[PDB]
Amino acid sequence: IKKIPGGAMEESLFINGVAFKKTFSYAGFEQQPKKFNNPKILSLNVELELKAEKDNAEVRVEHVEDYQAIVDAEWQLIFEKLRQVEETGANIVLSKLPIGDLATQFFADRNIFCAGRVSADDMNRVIQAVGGSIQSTTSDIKPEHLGTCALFEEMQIGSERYNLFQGCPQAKTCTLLLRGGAEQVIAEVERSLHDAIMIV
Amino acid sequence: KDQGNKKRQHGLEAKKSHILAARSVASIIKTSLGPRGLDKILISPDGEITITNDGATILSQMELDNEIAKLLVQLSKSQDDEIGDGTTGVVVLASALLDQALELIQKGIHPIKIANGFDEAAKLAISKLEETCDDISASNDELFRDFLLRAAKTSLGSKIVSKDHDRFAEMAVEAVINVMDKDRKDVDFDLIKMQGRVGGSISDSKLINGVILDKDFSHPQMPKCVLPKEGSDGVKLAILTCPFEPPKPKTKHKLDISSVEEYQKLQTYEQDKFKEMIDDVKKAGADVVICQWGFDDEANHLLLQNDLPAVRWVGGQELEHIAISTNGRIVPRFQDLSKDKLGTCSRIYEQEFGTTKDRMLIIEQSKETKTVTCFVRGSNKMIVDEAERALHDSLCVVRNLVKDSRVVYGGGAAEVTMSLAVSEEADKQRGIDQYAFRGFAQALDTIPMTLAENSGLDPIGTLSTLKSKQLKEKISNIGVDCLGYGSNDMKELFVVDPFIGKKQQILLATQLCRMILKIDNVIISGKD
Amino acid sequence: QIFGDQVTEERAENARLSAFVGAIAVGDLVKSTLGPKGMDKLLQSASSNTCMVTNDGATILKSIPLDNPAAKVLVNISKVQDDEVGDGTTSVTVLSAELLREAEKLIDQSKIHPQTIIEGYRLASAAALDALTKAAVDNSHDKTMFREDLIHIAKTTLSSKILSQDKDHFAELATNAILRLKGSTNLEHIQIIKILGGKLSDSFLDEGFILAKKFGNNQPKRIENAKILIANTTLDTDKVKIFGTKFKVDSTAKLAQLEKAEREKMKNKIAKISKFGINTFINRQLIYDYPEQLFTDLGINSIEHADFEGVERLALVTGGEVVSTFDEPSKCKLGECDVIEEIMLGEQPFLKFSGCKAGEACTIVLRGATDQTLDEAERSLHDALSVLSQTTKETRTVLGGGCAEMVMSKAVDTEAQNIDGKKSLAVEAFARALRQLPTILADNAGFDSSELVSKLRSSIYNGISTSGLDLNNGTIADMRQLGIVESYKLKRAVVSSASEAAEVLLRVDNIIRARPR
Amino acid sequence: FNNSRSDTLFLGGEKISGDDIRNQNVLATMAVANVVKSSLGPVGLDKMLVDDIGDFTVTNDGATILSLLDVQHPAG
Amino acid sequence: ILIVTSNQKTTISNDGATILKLLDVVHPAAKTLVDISRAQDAEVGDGTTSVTILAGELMKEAKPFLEEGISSHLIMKGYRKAVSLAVEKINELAVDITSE
Amino acid sequence: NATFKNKEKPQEVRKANIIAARSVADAIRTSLGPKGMDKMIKTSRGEIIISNDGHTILKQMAILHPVARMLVEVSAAQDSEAGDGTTSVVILTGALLGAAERLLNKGIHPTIIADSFQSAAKRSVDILLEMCHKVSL
Amino acid sequence: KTSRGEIIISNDGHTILKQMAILHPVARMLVEVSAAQDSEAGDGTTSVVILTGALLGAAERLLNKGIHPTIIADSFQSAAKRSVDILLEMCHKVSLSDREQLVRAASTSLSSKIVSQYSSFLAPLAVDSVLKISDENSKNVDLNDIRLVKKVGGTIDDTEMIDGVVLTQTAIKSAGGPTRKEKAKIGLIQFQISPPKPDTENNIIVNDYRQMDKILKEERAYLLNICKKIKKAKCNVLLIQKSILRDAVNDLALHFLSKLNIMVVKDIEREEIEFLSKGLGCKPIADIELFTEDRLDSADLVEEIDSDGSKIVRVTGIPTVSVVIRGANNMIIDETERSLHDALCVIRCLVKERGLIAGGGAPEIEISRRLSKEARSM
Ligand SMILES: Nc1ncnc2c1ncn2[C@@H]1O[C@H](COP(=O)(O)OP(=O)(O)O)[C@@H](O)[C@H]1O
Ligand SMILES: Nc1ncnc2c1ncn2[C@@H]1O[C@H](COP(=O)(O)OP(=O)(O)O)[C@@H](O)[C@H]1O
Ligand SMILES: Nc1ncnc2c1ncn2[C@@H]1O[C@H](COP(=O)(O)OP(=O)(O)O)[C@@H](O)[C@H]1O
Ligand code: BEF
Ligand code: BEF
Ligand code: BEF
Ligand code: BEF
Ligand code: BEF
Ligand SMILES: [Mg+2]
Ligand SMILES: [Mg+2]
Numbered sequence A: 001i002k003k004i005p006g007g008a009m010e011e012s013l014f015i016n017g018v019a020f021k022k023t024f025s026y027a028g029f030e031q032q033p034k035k036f037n038n039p040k041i042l043s044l045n046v047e048l049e050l051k052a053e054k055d056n057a058e059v060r061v062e063h064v065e066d067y068q069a070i071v072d073a074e075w076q077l078i079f080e081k082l083r084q085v086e087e088t089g090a091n092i093v094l095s096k097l098p099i100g101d102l103a104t105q106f107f108a109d110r111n112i113f114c115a116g117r118v119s120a121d122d123m124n125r126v127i128q129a130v131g132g133s134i135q136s137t138t139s140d141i142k143p144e145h146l147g148t149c150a151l152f153e154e155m156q157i158g159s160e161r162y163n164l165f166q167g168c169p170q171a172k173t174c175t176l177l178l179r180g181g182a183e184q185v186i187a188e189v190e191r192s193l194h195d196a197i198m199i200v
Numbered sequence B: 001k002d003q004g005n006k007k008r009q010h011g012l013e014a015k016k017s018h019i020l021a022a023r024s025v026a027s028i029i030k031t032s033l034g035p036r037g038l039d040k041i042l043i044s045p046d047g048e049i050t051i052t053n054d055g056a057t058i059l060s061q062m063e064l065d066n067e068i069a070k071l072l073v074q075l076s077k078s079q080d081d082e083i084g085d086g087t088t089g090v091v092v093l094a095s096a097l098l099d100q101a102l103e104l105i106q107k108g109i110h111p112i113k114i115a116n117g118f119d120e121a122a123k124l125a126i127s128k129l130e131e132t133c134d135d136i137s138a139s140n141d142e143l144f145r146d147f148l149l150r151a152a153k154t155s156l157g158s159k160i161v162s163k164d165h166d167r168f169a170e171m172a173v174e175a176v177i178n179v180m181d182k183d184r185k186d187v188d189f190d191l192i193k194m195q196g197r198v199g200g201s202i203s204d205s206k207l208i209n210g211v212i213l214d215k216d217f218s219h220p221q222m223p224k225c226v227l228p229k230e231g232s233d234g235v236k237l238a239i240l241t242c243p244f245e246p247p248k249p250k251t252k253h254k255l256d257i258s259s260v261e262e263y264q265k266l267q268t269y270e271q272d273k274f275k276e277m278i279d280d281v282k283k284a285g286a287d288v289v290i291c292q293w294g295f296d297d298e299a300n301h302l303l304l305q306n307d308l309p310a311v312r313w314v315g316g317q318e319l320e321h322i323a324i325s326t327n328g329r330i331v332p333r334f335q336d337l338s339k340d341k342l343g344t345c346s347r348i349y350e351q352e353f354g355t356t357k358d359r360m361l362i363i364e365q366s367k368e369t370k371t372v373t374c375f376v377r378g379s380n381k382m383i384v385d386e387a388e389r390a391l392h393d394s395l396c397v398v399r400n401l402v403k404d405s406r407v408v409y410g411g412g413a414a415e416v417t418m419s420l421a422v423s424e425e426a427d428k429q430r431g432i433d434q435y436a437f438r439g440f441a442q443a444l445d446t447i448p449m450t451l452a453e454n455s456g457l458d459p460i461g462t463l464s465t466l467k468s469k470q471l472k473e474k475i476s477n478i479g480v481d482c483l484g485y486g487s488n489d490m491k492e493l494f495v496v497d498p499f500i501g502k503k504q505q506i507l508l509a510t511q512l513c514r515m516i517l518k519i520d521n522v523i524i525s526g527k528d
Numbered sequence C: 001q002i003f004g005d006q007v008t009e010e011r012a013e014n015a016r017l018s019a020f021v022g023a024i025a026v027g028d029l030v031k032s033t034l035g036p037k038g039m040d041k042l043l044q045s046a047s048s049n050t051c052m053v054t055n056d057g058a059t060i061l062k063s064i065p066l067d068n069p070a071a072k073v074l075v076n077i078s079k080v081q082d083d084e085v086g087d088g089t090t091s092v093t094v095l096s097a098e099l100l101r102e103a104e105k106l107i108d109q110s111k112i113h114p115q116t117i118i119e120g121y122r123l124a125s126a127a128a129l130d131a132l133t134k135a136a137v138d139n140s141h142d143k144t145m146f147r148e149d150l151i152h153i154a155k156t157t158l159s160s161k162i163l164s165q166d167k168d169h170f171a172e173l174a175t176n177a178i179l180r181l182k183g184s185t186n187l188e189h190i191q192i193i194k195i196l197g198g199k200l201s202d203s204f205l206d207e208g209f210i211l212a213k214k215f216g217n218n219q220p221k222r223i224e225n226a227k228i229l230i231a232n233t234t235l236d237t238d239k240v241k242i243f244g245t246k247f248k249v250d251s252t253a254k255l256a257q258l259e260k261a262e263r264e265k266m267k268n269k270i271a272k273i274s275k276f277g278i279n280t281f282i283n284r285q286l287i288y289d290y291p292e293q294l295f296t297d298l299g300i301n302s303i304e305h306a307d308f309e310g311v312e313r314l315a316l317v318t319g320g321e322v323v324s325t326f327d328e329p330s331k332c333k334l335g336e337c338d339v340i341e342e343i344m345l346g347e348q349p350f351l352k353f354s355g356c357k358a359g360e361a362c363t364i365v366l367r368g369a370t371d372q373t374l375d376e377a378e379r380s381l382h383d384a385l386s387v388l389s390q391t392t393k394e395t396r397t398v399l400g401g402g403c404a405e406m407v408m409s410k411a412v413d414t415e416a417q418n419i420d421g422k423k424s425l426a427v428e429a430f431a432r433a434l435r436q437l438p439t440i441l442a443d444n445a446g447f448d449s450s451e452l453v454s455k456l457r458s459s460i461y462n463g464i465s466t467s468g469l470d471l472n473n474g475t476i477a478d479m480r481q482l483g484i485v486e487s488y489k490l491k492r493a494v495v496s497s498a499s500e501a502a503e504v505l506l507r508v509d510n511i512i513r514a515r516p517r
Numbered sequence D: 001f002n003n004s005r006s007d008t009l010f011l012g013g014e015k016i017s018g019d020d021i022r023n024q025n026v027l028a029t030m031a032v033a034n035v036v037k038s039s040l041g042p043v044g045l046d047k048m049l050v051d052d053i054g055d056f057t058v059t060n061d062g063a064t065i066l067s068l069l070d071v072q073h074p075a076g
Numbered sequence E: 001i002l003i004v005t006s007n008q009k010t011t012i013s014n015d016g017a018t019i020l021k022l023l024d025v026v027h028p029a030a031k032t033l034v035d036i037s038r039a040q041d042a043e044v045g046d047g048t049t050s051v052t053i054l055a056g057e058l059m060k061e062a063k064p065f066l067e068e069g070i071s072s073h074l075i076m077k078g079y080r081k082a083v084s085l086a087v088e089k090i091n092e093l094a095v096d097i098t099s100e
Numbered sequence F: 001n002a003t004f005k006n007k008e009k010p011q012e013v014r015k016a017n018i019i020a021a022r023s024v025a026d027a028i029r030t031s032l033g034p035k036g037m038d039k040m041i042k043t044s045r046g047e048i049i050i051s052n053d054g055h056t057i058l059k060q061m062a063i064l065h066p067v068a069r070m071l072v073e074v075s076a077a078q079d080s081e082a083g084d085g086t087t088s089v090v091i092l093t094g095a096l097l098g099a100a101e102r103l104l105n106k107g108i109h110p111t112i113i114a115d116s117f118q119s120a121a122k123r124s125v126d127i128l129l130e131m132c133h134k135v136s137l
Numbered sequence G: 001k002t003s004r005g006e007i008i009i010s011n012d013g014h015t016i017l018k019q020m021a022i023l024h025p026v027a028r029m030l031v032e033v034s035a036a037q038d039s040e041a042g043d044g045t046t047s048v049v050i051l052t053g054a055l056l057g058a059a060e061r062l063l064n065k066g067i068h069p070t071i072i073a074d075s076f077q078s079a080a081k082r083s084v085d086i087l088l089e090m091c092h093k094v095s096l097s098d099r100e101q102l103v104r105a106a107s108t109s110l111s112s113k114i115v116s117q118y119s120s121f122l123a124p125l126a127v128d129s130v131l132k133i134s135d136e137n138s139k140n141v142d143l144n145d146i147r148l149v150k151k152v153g154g155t156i157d158d159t160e161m162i163d164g165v166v167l168t169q170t171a172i173k174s175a176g177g178p179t180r181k182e183k184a185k186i187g188l189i190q191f192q193i194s195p196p197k198p199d200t201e202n203n204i205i206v207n208d209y210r211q212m213d214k215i216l217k218e219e220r221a222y223l224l225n226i227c228k229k230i231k232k233a234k235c236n237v238l239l240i241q242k243s244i245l246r247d248a249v250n251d252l253a254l255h256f257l258s259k260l261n262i263m264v265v266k267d268i269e270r271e272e273i274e275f276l277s278k279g280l281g282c283k284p285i286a287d288i289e290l291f292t293e294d295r296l297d298s299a300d301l302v303e304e305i306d307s308d309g310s311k312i313v314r315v316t317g318i319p320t321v322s323v324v325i326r327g328a329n330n331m332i333i334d335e336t337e338r339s340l341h342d343a344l345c346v347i348r349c350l351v352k353e354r355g356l357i358a359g360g361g362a363p364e365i366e367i368s369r370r371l372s373k374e375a376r377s378m
């Protein structure tokens, strides 16, 4: 369940597929369509940043050329893994880890949408919706791995942008946004509803 | 556990308390509902002084400990979130309702049974309105522009902005058209930079078809303005996120230097390397550089000699608007330049400001870009900071009109149509739900009455007139003479409130009621 | 209940008072710091020993702590007015406040709704502000006349301050110093340098531009027909931005190599510069002992550390360009002047450049008998440089000394003839408050203000629209005839910036202070 | 648990209503009675009631036990 | 109910579990009512309010005996059967359907 | 429109009085009729009392607000003339004041309410008589 | 006795007021006018104050008979800039030729200081010393060139002009102590005789048995050749400019410079450089690769005479005077310096402004008598 500040205590929405926050914290967004019908969802698990979000090693060189060399390598090292995703021919690229400025900028150029740092318990509902299947590396990315919904959009519900993959006749997991005029009522709904769902 | 420092309330008192607490929050903001309303100076515990007719904003600032008030704080807030204009009113209606509900209670009625009564009578009004409302989108194109404006205006009459409400209104109307599409009907407010600075009056608040940002233009010698570079297609500009400094790793370093050999090569490495970039941008064929991160002394000077005005350091949202405004691409490395990813803007100038040593800059476009910048000005901070939120209010009512072209004529009449319709169904109700319906409709009457109270008209008087007239003729739209002019009839007078919002409002209050009433037990503790 | 822990609420009657008192109080603080016969107020901050005397309205208000919203509103309005025009700082608060005073009258004892008091004002303002434009004559054309016009503005914008004494003197300085730019409205191009000793009348504008910081280890103490390379480049250990370059050797000798290697880079870069053919090299950055020795031995004078602004000044008097890339001489506008002699300003080393290529950057040296007098003469001057700097970017002018506002009075007091009922009253009140300006003006001088202003208003009433207050004979003479011009932007700003203040306050019907932490 | 507050009806003291007080009374009477319910019957037994000085008195006369036992509360 | 715990977080609800969780409660005995209310919101999800009303109520009806001077081991047995019978009776009435 | 403002506003003092006063006739309401329950007061001196007689509950109640104390005096006079109904006389003011709470909201001058209330009362009393079933000793 | 606890004694007003702890704001004002009296004349800091003292009383008196202060203020200006003219019109102008006069001034100046009974060699001391950098037409003469160095001990009389110049540093305790070299050539090394100092992340790695002495014995020479090049360029006395950066004269580099009989003297403050290049006639030496025999001087004698537990340096025989002051109590050693500055500044006034009036109250009285008459004509 998801709670959204404001609205009628019944202007709540039942997403058929899955809906989640909008962790999309990077520059270069606003490009990337915010709506697709049958997009090719890539439920990826890790990274997508230049210098890497974490982990490292040491690069020691005694040649001026090696310096500029290792640099050009870094870049190509990313871009590749990056195009590796492009290659999967996806429209929506999600990852439980970041999607750096450059990264999200790239897909933005070639009308591919994304979002970094997705909620862990979310990707699992994302899988169960578009029927994808988490992938840790960019290498052996086969197509039964990805997923596709009936419709994707980036809403402005209750003054808060909400990425949501609605319409998914092949789902085993829905998500539902709750509304209310106070963080107490939305809260009571979510509990008044868990008491029902659990009885059904 | 913790038995002491823990109090309990339950009905006899309790309900009175809550009801009264609401009522009291109300009594403060009622004097701010109307085009004759007044603002309220609020002061942050730090010392920040604000002044504003905005409902939500006021009740957020009142550092208050009463639990029920804490609720109305959010009630006005939630509404601000969903619509952007209710605020001041949603609470009024809510309180009135509570007083009403309470009143019945001391006559033997169950609190929870009144609740269901109200929820019902409400749903009805929502309908009696959903039926009488009018449509705009589906009627005309030049008239849509007009109606869409005639709302933004009405939406501003209760603000300091009112003074120059012509401009502020047509500004909000525009600002939204230019970033949302008739089909998606989605106004993303990230595409509208609401930036304001001091100076002049609120009148000198224009709308910019690009963006602003603060920059001295990298090197002083650089030009101040930027022409479309002879017969070209406007101006082209670099939009790069790479620093004009010698490229570096992103994993380690330690470029071990065995002897003068390699140090001799690094020497000439950085040297011409600055030419490797200064050239790179020249090649893509651009006029001005907008780099996300700063440049070195050398690299800067070169940008000078090569007639390449520069913009050292530009934030995320910053750089990004410069893209979407000028139709460009956010280029990573240097070699990734090209005459086809540049920014096709229409001008760039370094804007002066009184004698303020700041002196920011601007990027225009002539033709309605996919980014607007309402640049607000005023004689003093507060006037600005209020006028910005005042602008925002209208911008929202313009967004609601594309998301639901339905309009209802306010002036209080919109609330009278309910009170009228809901009260009718009361006589048919009889018994207990009769008292509820009468109540719900009765609380409603406080909305217009309050307008009368503030515009200087006898409440009972304007109500009987508004009710009679809107019955002896048709359950239409006959509002209060809030300002004067000939007579009622919000239509002629051009007083309009988006329907979509009004519904939300007349719900958010009844619902909030429906919660409070169900509370018959309370247990507060202290701050150990 | 609701609220809590020290939050304080002021409803209608209360709020309104809090407000009115505040503004009126602020105004009644700076009424003495107006008028050519006005006085200064001494103040002292957290350091105690940090006094200061001033006639700058905005200055006083900016400093004076307050807890009252309505007051801070006025304070703040002063800083604004102080920005977009540098002057009128006082004239604005006062006229702002007096308008509020005139309003609580229309309320507390006439029973008129504040919103209707606004209704009237908003109109009165239109009419008032209008009559200004509609009466403001300018001399944009005829550059030899606008010089006389512009000089008057300084002449009178300087009365009231200490400088009012040798006002004629500073009058020229200001005028000239602005003209010597004629363009950039940014006053950071004029550097003011102050030093104790002798009369203020000894202050001057070195049309050759003076600079602090002496050159070289012991270079020529004076240059001739200088050809200067103004530059800003790293001058103490280079490798600009390759950071991470370690020097691992297997023997101290291989270090000794790389060591002299670095000291070579300096003789290199220093050379590429000598190739520019210059008798003086000024760098924003510093220049250590060695890179300097080079110059001392080439004759090229090394004048290091002049920050950013310090270079831009030189680059406007001498006509050079900043530069940091000597990767090729030429294509770099080199600056020049007649002399770069070292002078002494009362126990201090300075560099009096001379005959520069049309100095669009100047230096004014202020001389007072006490730091107080300097620091005040400092802004007392700024109050001139700022207006003039603006009037070149707004040639319109109007006569003050009462006249201006008194004209706007007869304007409003006239348009208050066609009006509704109550509104009219606010309108009449406006002109009334406006009229309180010449009143307060004459007051400070010491005349029977009531009597004098009534004489003034009488002329401006019955035609004329030129008479003003000769605050010396205490008569009412012709202002255009006495060179008491004032920037149009200025007065128009006051009549505007104030009306806004009023409206924002009259609209308040409640005040809430939160639990201060 | 625990009654508290006031809000309106400013009264120079305490005031419990309904359930709250109605139970308090019952509890009161209950306690004062239960002390001497162990003295009822032949099989019942006496008790020693010590003061502050340390002296005392042992007695089954319910009336003197309740007299000797400091009771503060109306229903007590 | 409306509980404003010493936390300062204000809540309003009916999930008897949620209320009995915000009451802190430290009395050993009375604290079991907090436990059986939590389990009820687990193995079932609803009825939480009631599990306690009853649980309590029984203890209430045990007072007469305990007071009159009866063993508790006997009251414990008595209630033990009572549940067994009552439990089967529900199973006995548990109207199973599908298209009935 | 645009006429007379009333700079002054201790409007609130009235509603404040009414509410701090009506709260009095509240504590009493419970003791009206054959189902009315008695109050138990433990005086400042420590003397305990129990009764349904309003005038005596209010008297010994320790009412603090000034306009609230007013109720005790009207119940006092109910005892001085009738000798009975001390409970009812209070409960009446209780909602008669609420009647003003309601009317004052729709902006009717209280002096119109005050003077009108008189006439509506001295008209009510007459109705009592006109329907009074007189007896003889 | 300052807030810090340092004790001071003096007749110099500007310094008494400065260190006095005046609290009232308009009172602090006096210190600033006395401050500026020091900045232009350099003398009379006491008088300038006492003047305001009754000039303000003049307003106290006039303000009583209701005369607007702005009439008093503006009038006072004119009455002053009229008084100054009277000074000039009665000023008995002199020329820097007249050494008979310039000493009389400096003498009657310091005839109110602790160093009064020593005005004899003090009065001209100022005169000569000022003229030593005065020239004639230099207008404001800088007094920075008159390096005074005070050293505790003795009395006031023990103060000499010192032919050459006076350094301020120690010398050599460490390896081979020179401390005195007759007819020497000095050099201001701005360099630094220490091991290899690469301004970039340097580092000398080792990974060989024998490689040990390689690193070592090598730099052992690095200091040597530099030391030779010095002797080679015929550099007798060395002067190293204090480098906090990273060493000045390595402990080792002293064993060498010791043997080589080169008296070295370190910690030459950066503000000295310029000055030392005059008094010493020396020349700054950025590198060693620029350390040449011409960038030196003709010093006839350099020696650290231990005056008695004091030790002061001297460079005798070679636009810069260098006087050394002594006294018993630090309050003296300090005071006399400022009581010499009042005299030195006395001359500076004549350097920039010829002429001198008959002091001793007489001019004060005259301006009074003059204005007094002119007053009747107003
Ligand atoms: N020009 C007017 N004439 C008649 N009614 C108006 C006018 N302006 C606003 N109103 C009424 O006042 C309401 C707006 O109140 P306002 O003080 O703006 O608070 P908010 O809009 O935040 O609730 C409108 O919905 C309408 O009912
Ligand atoms: N010479 C003068 N004679 C009469 N009025 C003058 C004269 N000089 C300036 N004024 C008036 O002084 C007023 C401004 O006073 P000032 O103390 O300078 O306040 P501000 O901070 O507004 O400049 C203006 O109204 C101007 O007309
Ligand atoms: N038999 C009854 N049934 C209904 N009302 C009755 C009955 N007998 C008396 N009452 C009511 O009891 C009411 C209140 O009485 P009480 O509580 O004693 O207060 P007071 O008598 O002081 O008003 C009386 O007004 C009367 O209407
Ligand atoms: F007063 Be509202 F917020 F338009
Ligand atoms: F006091 Be003002 F700025 F002349
Ligand atoms: F309160 Be229960 F869980 F329905
Ligand atoms: F309670 Be009443 F006075 F009988
Ligand atoms: F006391 Be003075 F300055 F010689
Ligand atoms: Mg609104
Ligand atoms: Mg001025």
Ligand SMILES: [Mg+2]
Pocket (backbone or CB within 6 Å): G043, G044, G109, G110, G112, G342
């Ligand atoms: Mg002296």
